[PDB]
Assembly symmetry: D3
Homo-oligomer: 96 residues x 6
């Protein structure tokens, strides 16, 4: 609910973090379009649809491309530190 950036630490035993990302087309930012039930993201209970990913393990994804967001997530290791900012209006305005 907070519009202030949040730090969320997710742990994974396999590649999946439990969410799907969109954006990164032309510097509009990377957003979480949906959370998968039972996965790390779901279990934490902090990440949601509409969240924008500011960074993943220090790597700045604000003006990142989808390909970069994907690479950052892929190499985040088992403990993934996501800084997300809940901004639905923008998500809608840009994707829905």
């Amino acid at each position: 609910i907070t519009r202030e950036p949040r730090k969320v630490v997710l742990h994974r035993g396999s590649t999946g973090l439990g969410f799907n990302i969109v954006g990164g087309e032309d510097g509009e930012g990377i957003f979480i379009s949906f959370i998968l039930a039972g996965g790390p993201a779901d279990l934490s209970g902090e990440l949601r649809k509409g969240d924008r990913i500011i960074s993943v393990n220090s790597v700045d994804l604000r003006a990142a491309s989808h390909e970069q967001a994907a690479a950052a997530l892929k190499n985040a290791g088992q403990a993934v530190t996501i800084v997300a900012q809940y901004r639905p209006e923008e998500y809608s305005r840009q994707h829905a």
Copy 2:
């Protein structure tokens, strides 16, 4: 490599299918933007980045919205039948 629709059956024991989807913004179609290592999609070896999802278990996703694509995948059960069509040019043209 084939541009003809392919039927791909993925099996899952948890919510994840092993890929990330984009599109579904304004009827441009749903595409696989990236495959996750070790997941069902990766293991099958048929699905790839650039693939467009024509349908998931009969449900037509050609002109579906991201929200619908997500719901179809969510309720596909354990055996998910995807009909994908490899069209990179369009993926680029529309997302990259």
Copy 3:
């Protein structure tokens, strides 16, 4: 919703089937007390809280003890064929 026995086939890559069982104390039957999100049971969408397990791979669990129900499930292999019968009244009447 049907009170007639249903055959449900769940597939697992690990020990978990995605549900929790109670009963088997004094021949009252084995019941599913809760479904876990993302697991096989959840994904199938057929099994629910209140369901009574008639059998698991031919093994009759009607008048089974909790210990037997556990052993049947443990050795069901990867393809587990459950015959469940939805009877909430009895579940309540006996456990809640």
Copy 4:
């Protein structure tokens, strides 16, 4: 073997903790009826059949109902702190 409460921290990447719970019918307490091979509970090696769950992440489950025990576990996040007390006699006396 100790009858003194033990703190056990289990980590999960999916909903499952690796054990099955019974009780919570009429304030007799929540007990672990069986451990699943390969799951978090099994891997830790501390939790066993006969253990009574005093609490899960501060939430007191002593006189909890099965429904509450289930909700506590469901929302425990990825790091689940269980305080269990090994009391087989009571488990038998009440369930077996």
Copy 5:
């Protein structure tokens, strides 16, 4: 127990099959040195320590090198058809 080749079909949602392999050094054959609890191999209940892998999805591994055995398993897809032959004497004679 049978010394006659057996066909065993394992299903996986992730890379792991649930067993560890040795051999393939100098054409002595590939053997299963240990089974992991809860994994596909364990769940099937057919594969055991001492088993020699004749083939994996038609690919003949009799005189295969460890590197080839690894590649065959890696690309077996989700349904892996193993033809194993239980020969402990040889396993000992060659590895233990």
Copy 6:
């Protein structure tokens, strides 16, 4: 790349660590023959083929037998502390 021992902490929610081990035949040491995609080992990005396992949670595996290496790994719990030393020459010299 470093030939100096490295401490690598892997986390698992199931029995699998994400790698396959060989050796332990006649005190030549235990080595990682291959890494599985998506598993803990792969995700960490530190362990590789050719690595020799000096210890797993203090348990010295230098002159361990395959059976001991297997037992150490089996009981390492969820947080597994591996001290590996990258020595390919020896791996080749002894296995390939």
